[PDB]
Amino acid sequence: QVQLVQSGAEVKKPGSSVKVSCKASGGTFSSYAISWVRQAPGQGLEWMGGIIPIFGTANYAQKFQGRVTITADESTSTAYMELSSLRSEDTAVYYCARHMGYQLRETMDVWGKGTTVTVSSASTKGPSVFPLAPSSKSTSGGTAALGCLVKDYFPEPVTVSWNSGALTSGVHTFPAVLQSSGLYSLSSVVTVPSSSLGTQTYICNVNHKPSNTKVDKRVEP
C-alpha cells in the first residue's frame, strides 16, 4: 500500500554535501522507524543511520558520525539524509527503508527505489561522437555491424537511438566504461543486412541530458 518515493540522482564534487529525500506516499511515517542504507557500486548493503520521529530519536553508525544527518518532516511525511564532506568513496545508491514498527531492531519491510549519488572531481561535459564504420572485418553471414563511439562525457547517463527510433532490432547499446580521466565512454552497435549498406541511411542519435547536448551522426562505409 505505502510507497517510499525518493528524490532524483545527484552529482557532486568532493567536499560538498548532498541531501536526499524519501516521501511516504499513500502512507505515513508517524508510527514507524526509518533507516538509510547505502550500496557502493558492486558492493554490499551498509546501514548509515535511522530516525524514530515518534520518540524524537536518531541513531547513526560510528563510521558516519559527524558526517551524516537524518531528519524527518511529519507535515509532509518525508525523511531526509544529508551526507557532508563527500568523497569519491561516497558514490553509491542510497535507499530509504521503513521498519515494521517504531523499532530499528524490527525488520525493514518497505524499501524505496534508491537515489544514485555520484561524487567526482570531473565537470559536466558532452561527448564526442565518432562513427564505427561497417567493413569486411565487421561483416559475416550477410550482416554488417556498424556503430557510434560516444566518448569522454560526464556524468551519466547517455541515451542512444538509431534513425530517431525507427530502427530498433539489431541495436545494442553497451554500458559505459569509466576512464582514469574521470570521463565515461560507451558504444552502440546495430547489425544490418550487408546488402542494405549502399541504400539505407544509418544515423545514431546521442542524447546527453546532463550537459544538454544532442548529437546526430550518420555512420557510413
Added chain:
Amino acid sequence: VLTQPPSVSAAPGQKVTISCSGSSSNIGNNYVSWYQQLPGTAPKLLIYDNNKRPSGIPDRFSGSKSGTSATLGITGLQTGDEADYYCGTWDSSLSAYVVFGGGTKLTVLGQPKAAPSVTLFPPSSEELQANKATLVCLISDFYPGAVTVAWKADSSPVKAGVETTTPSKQSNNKYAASSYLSLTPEQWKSHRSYSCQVTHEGSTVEKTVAPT
C-alpha cells in the same frame, strides 16, 4: 560484521542454502531477516523473525536460526531467483546499529552455453584527426555471464590504457561486455596490429585490426 559466502552457483530445480554467521550481540540475541536484491533493483524483504514470510513470498523460501548462525533455504530453484541475498539483524551493543552480511551472489545456471560474439573496431579517421585513438571491442551473446579480456600490441600483452566493463544481461538473457584500448595515433600506426582476446569458459575468441 555478519559473514556469508560471497557466491553460490546452482541449477534450476536444485535446493540451496545460504548461511549467515554472527556473534552473541547480533544474531545470538536478535531476529534475523533476509533480503533479496534482483539485479538493478532495491532489496526486498524475503524472511523476517528468523522464519516468517511476508505476504507474496513463495513458500520455496524458508529460514532458520540457531545460536549465532542463520540459514536461508530455497527449494525448486528458478532462474528468476538469481540475485544477491543479504542477511540482516540488529546489533544490541551500546552503540547500536543494523548490521548486514556481505551478501551472497546466487548465480542460477539455467540457460544454454553460448560463446561470445566479438567485434573489434579500429579508430575512426575522425578520431585520429582529433589526435586520439580508441580500439573498441564489443562482446555479446555469451552465457554464462563472465569473460576475461586481454589485449595484444602485435604479439605482446598490453595492459595500460585498458578499460573493461562488467558483464550486463541482455534482453535475450545472454550477456554483453565492452573493452576499450586507448592509444596515441603514433602507437596505433607504429605497430603491425592490435588484438582483443576474449576468454569464456576457458575457450578464447580473438579479433585483430591493423592501421588502414
